[PDB]
Structure 1
Amino acid sequence: QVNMRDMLKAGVHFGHQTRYWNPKMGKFIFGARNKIHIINLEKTLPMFNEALTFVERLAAGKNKILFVGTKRSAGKIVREEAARCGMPYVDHRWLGGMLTNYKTIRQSIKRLRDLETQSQDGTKKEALMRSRDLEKLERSLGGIKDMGGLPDALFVIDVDHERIAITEANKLGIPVIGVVDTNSSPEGVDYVIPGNDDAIRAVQLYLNSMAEAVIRGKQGA
């Protein structure tokens, strides 16, 4: 949870190169070294918990938390997270429309749904192009199968990259927990998490602590 070692050993402290940096993220910076900014991990800790506390006090009252993270780096660690442990997620291309235009995205969760007979039957040419394009809908909307409407919290692990995601969340009102690296901007994210969002090591750190947040918050209730 709050152990310097793992955080210090697994990414986190490292920020983006000084040239690419936001002046809004000045407070969460403990200076610089070797022409790179060092995120302050003495202020990450405190906030982390408020991010974990919130998340664990959301599943205790039974709620949904979207796990956004459609990035090469986080494109495998966001499959073995809290979404596999009982949450909704997105790992490939946050389609600009989900949550704000959820009604039109609601009616496109059926790719194989209305063909659960001949999809296991393996026609031939008329099925192969749908078989091929069954994964299409299985990749983009694949992790949003179960949702029952909108969520109540969003958890992005790279606010600068998944900036569209947060614009919709804020537009509707659903709180956003998010890792903000030095080059990103901490504006719009309800609960911030100032930390590295590029190294895999750090990527699992939040995911695994958020996986366990709902894991030690769903059994309680």
Structure 2
Amino acid sequence: QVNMRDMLKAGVHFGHQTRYWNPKMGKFIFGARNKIHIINLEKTLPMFNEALTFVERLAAGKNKILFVGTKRSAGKIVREEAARCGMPYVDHRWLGGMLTNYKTIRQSIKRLRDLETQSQDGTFDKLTKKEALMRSRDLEKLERSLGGIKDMGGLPDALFVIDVDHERIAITEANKLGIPVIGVVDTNSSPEGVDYVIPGNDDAIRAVQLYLNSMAEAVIRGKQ
């Protein structure tokens, strides 16, 4: 599936500075070089296919997993990879409580998807003046924060994270509701809320696509 040689090409071994390292990555660190911690690979791959093995199962069970990466680096890649598997996502900001407070999120989703019908039905022309608040402030805002989670339906069956520290609000919500989490952890990350860890670079552009492309192909294989 995924070779070790492809990993170092994407720079998955590179982490952060030794100052910011998290002691709980001591088991995932092969060593350090020029004041930069480098992640062990011989443990990364066997743990990496297990994440691909798990997502294989629930994809066959027709289960929804959320593609959340909110960093500006891995912003667009998450959205495009989620769409390829036709799978919901969030990449601008983890809003406070889509999971523990899904009830009001559904109300925001309701005003979202009804609002597209207003554009489709041509009701916009009936308002004419004082309309740009609807056109930009009202559609375009809602397409950002809930664009991916529009057709998601129910509660997630698993959660995919990038930079679990930056996207830490998501971890607490998923853990409280007992949602399994598969996130990429750097040398500065805390693997205490996530369940299926894989260690590697989490802000390099090459690294994030390698996860997401492998993440997506394990979902497309499971649609059958």
Q: CA deviation at 1:116?
A: 5.0
Question: Which structure 2 residue ranges, 5 or more long, are not aligned?
Answer: 123-127
State the Cα deviation string for residues 81-103 of structure 1 (Å, max 9, x = none). Answer: 14441211101100011100111
Q: CA deviation at 1:114?
A: 3.4
- Structure 1 residues 155 and 112 mapped into 2: Cα distance closer, same or farther (>3 Å)? closer
> Which contiguous aligned blocks of 4+ residues in structure 1 show a shift greater than 6 angstroms?
none
Q: CA deviation at 1:126?
A: 2.9
Structure 1: how far apart are the matches of 2:67 and 2:115? Answer: 29
Cα pair 1:39 1:182 within 8 Å, conserved? yes
Q: CA deviation at 1:119?
A: 2.4
State the Cα deviation string for residues 3-22 of structure 1 (Å, max 9, x = none). Answer: 12110010210011100010
Structure 2: how far apart are the matches of 1:117 and 1:48? Answer: 42
RMSD: 1.7
- Structure 1 residues 169 and 126 mapped into 2: Cα distance closer, same or farther (>3 Å)? same
**Residue-pair matches, total:** 219
Which is further off, 46-55 or 116-125? 116-125
2:154 maps to 1:142: no
- Structure 1 residues 116 and 144 mapped into 2: Cα distance closer, same or farther (>3 Å)? closer
* SS of equivalent to 2:111: coil
Cα pair 1:67 1:83 within 8 Å, conserved? no
Q: CA deviation at 1:153?
A: 0.2
* SS of equivalent to 1:104: helix
Structure holding more helix per residue? 2
Cα pair 1:82 1:210 within 8 Å, conserved? no
Structure 2: how far apart are the matches of 1:65 and 1:117? Answer: 26
Q: CA deviation at 1:120?
A: 4.5
Alignment map for 1:144-183 (pairs within 5 Å): 144-183=149-188
Cα pair 2:183 2:194 within 8 Å, conserved? yes
* SS of equivalent to 2:23: coil
- Structure 1 residues 8 and 105 mapped into 2: Cα distance closer, same or farther (>3 Å)? same
Cα pair 2:69 2:162 within 8 Å, conserved? yes
- Structure 1 residues 52 and 131 mapped into 2: Cα distance closer, same or farther (>3 Å)? same
TM-score by length of 1: 0.93
Q: CA deviation at 1:115?
A: 4.4
State the Cα deviation string for residues 47-97 of structure 1 (Å, max 9, x = none). Answer: 111110001111111111111101101111011214441211101100011
* SS of equivalent to 1:192: strand
- Structure 1 residues 114 and 4 mapped into 2: Cα distance closer, same or farther (>3 Å)? closer
Cα pair 1:99 1:150 within 8 Å, conserved? yes
Cα pair 2:115 2:139 within 8 Å, conserved? no
2:92 counterpart residue number: 92
